[PDB]
Amino acid sequence: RHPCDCLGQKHKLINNCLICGRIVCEQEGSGPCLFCGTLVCTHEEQDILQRDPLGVLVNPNMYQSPPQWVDHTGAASQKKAFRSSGFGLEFNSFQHQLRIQDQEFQEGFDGGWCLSVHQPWASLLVRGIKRVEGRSWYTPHRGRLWIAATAKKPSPQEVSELQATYRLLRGKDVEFPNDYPSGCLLGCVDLIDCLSQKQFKEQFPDISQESDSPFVFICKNPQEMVVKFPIKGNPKIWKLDSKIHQGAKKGLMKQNKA
């Protein structure tokens, strides 16, 4: 048969199953219930036995058209007059200083900050194969940061030693994405902490031998998508442009669809 869902609101009813408490309709009956498979029958019939396009943020709806925007209103007409000011982005400025660097604020809000990592390390950083990153400078941005692939083409011999180094830590069981891009923005990882090597040994001695540097980035689970973002590349700790940041977030939703 077929478990019709009417619950007596579309047609008549029969006895409900005692085990499952499931209301059964007359559409399917005279047999075991679907949920638990026990015989169930009404009183009058058991007496005999007894006697023996698609927008980024939109849901499916019964609507002929989504609520598009119309700029004909005069309220926005006034705003267009004095909206000449704005569009000010600091981008990659070494002089930039948050001056409010509380850890809890950064991971709540994505500030668009991006970083450039060499492809042999960037691939393992974004796939989660490697857990700690090593750079000389210290970054107070402890929020979500994007990783841009380096422009230089990595040599095939570096992957051999990189794999050999991580055999004891990870092993050959985990598959490795040998397809290594270059100059893209495939990386998007969240940062939890940065500290010196001595404190890294003091507090995190288990995996400290993976990489050694004056300052250590500790990155948690990253994200992956199936589309590729071309980026020219910028020096370390650079603010991503609005257009790419908007597109990258949209792609993150499209991969979250799958």
Partner 1 sequence: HYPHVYDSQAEAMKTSAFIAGAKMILPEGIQRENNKLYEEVRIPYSEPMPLSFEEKPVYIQDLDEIGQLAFKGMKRLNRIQSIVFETAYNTNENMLICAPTGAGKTNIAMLTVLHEIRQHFQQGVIKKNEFKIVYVAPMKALAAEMTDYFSRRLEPLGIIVKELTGDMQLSKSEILRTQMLVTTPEKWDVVTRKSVGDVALSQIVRLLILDEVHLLHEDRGPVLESIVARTLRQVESTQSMIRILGLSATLPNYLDVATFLHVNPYIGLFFFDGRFRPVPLGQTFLGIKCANKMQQLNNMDEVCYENVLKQVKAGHQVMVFVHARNATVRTAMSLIERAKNCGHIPFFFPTQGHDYVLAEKQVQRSRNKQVRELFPDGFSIHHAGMLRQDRNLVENLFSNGHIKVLVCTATLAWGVNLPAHAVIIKGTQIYAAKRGSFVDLGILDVMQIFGRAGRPQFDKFGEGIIITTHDKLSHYLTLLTQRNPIESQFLESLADNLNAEIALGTVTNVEEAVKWISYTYLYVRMRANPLAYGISHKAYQIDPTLRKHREQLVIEVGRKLDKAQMIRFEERTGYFSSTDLGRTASHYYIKYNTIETFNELFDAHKTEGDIFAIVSKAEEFDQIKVREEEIEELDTLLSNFCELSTPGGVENSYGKINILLQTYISRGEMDSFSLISDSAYVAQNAARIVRALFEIALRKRWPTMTYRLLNLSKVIDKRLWGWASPLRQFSILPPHILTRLEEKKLTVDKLKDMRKDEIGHILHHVNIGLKVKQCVHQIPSVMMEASIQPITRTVLRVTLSIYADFTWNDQVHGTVGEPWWIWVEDPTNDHIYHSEYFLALKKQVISKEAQLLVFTIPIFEPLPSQYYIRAVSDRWLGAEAVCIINFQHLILPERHPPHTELLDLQPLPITALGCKAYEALYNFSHFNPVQTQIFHTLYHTDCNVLLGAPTGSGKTVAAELAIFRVFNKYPTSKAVYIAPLKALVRERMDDWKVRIEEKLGKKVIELTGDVTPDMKSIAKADLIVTTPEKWDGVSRSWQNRNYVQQVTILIIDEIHLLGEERGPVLEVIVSRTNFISSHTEKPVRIVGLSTALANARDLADWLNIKQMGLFNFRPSVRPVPLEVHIQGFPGQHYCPRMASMNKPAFQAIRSHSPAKPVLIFVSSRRQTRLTALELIAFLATEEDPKQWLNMDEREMENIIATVRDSNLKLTLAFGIGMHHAGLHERDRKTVEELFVNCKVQVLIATSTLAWGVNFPAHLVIIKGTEYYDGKTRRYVDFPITDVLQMMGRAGRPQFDDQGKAVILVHDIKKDFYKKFLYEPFPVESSLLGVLSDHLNAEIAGGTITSKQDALDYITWTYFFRRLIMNPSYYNLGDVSHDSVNKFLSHLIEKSLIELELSYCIEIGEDNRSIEPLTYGRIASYYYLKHQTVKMFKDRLKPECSTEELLSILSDAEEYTDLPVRHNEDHMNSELAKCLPIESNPHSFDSPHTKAHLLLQAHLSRAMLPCPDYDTDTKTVLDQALRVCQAMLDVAANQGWLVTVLNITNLIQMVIQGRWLKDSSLLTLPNIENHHLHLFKKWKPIMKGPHARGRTSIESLPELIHACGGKDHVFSSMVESELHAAKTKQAWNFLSHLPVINVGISVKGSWDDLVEGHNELSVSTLTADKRDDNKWIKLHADQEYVLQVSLQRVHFGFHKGKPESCAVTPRFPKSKDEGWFLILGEVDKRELIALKRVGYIRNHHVASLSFYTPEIPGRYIYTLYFMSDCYLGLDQQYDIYLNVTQAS
Q: How far apart are CA 132 and CA 81, in angstroms?
A: 50
Contact with Zn ion (CB under 5 A): which of 3, 36, 98, 161? 36
Beta bridge partners of 132: 218
Residue 12 or 51 having the CB closest to Zn ion = 12
CB of residue 43 vs partner 1: minimum separation in angstroms? Answer: 7
**155, interface contact from Zn ion, partner 1, none, CB < 5-8 Å by kind:** none
Contact with Zn ion (CB under 5 A): which of 1, 3, 4, 106? 4
Restricting to residues 63-122, which ones interact with Zn ion according to CB under 5 A? none
Residue 172 or 198 having the CB closest to partner 1 = 198
Alpha helices in the chain (DSSP H): 43-51, 74-82, 103-106, 119-126, 156-165, 197-203, 242-257
Residue 60 or 171 having the CB closest to partner 1 = 60
Are the CB atoms for 89 and 239 separated by under 8 Å?
Answer: yes
Q: Does 33 bind Zn ion (CB under 5 A)?
A: yes
Are the CB atoms for 240 and 113 separated by under 8 Å?
Answer: yes
Q: Does 195 bind Zn ion (CB under 5 A)?
A: no
**207, interface contact from partner 1, Zn ion, none, CB < 5-8 Å by kind:** none
Residues 182-213 as b/e (b if ≥16 CB within 10 A, e otherwise) read: ebbbbbbbbbebbeeeeebeeeeeeebebbee
CB of residue 163 vs partner 1: minimum separation in angstroms? Answer: 26
Interface with Zn ion by CB under 5 A: which residues? 4, 6, 17, 19-20, 25, 27, 33, 35-36
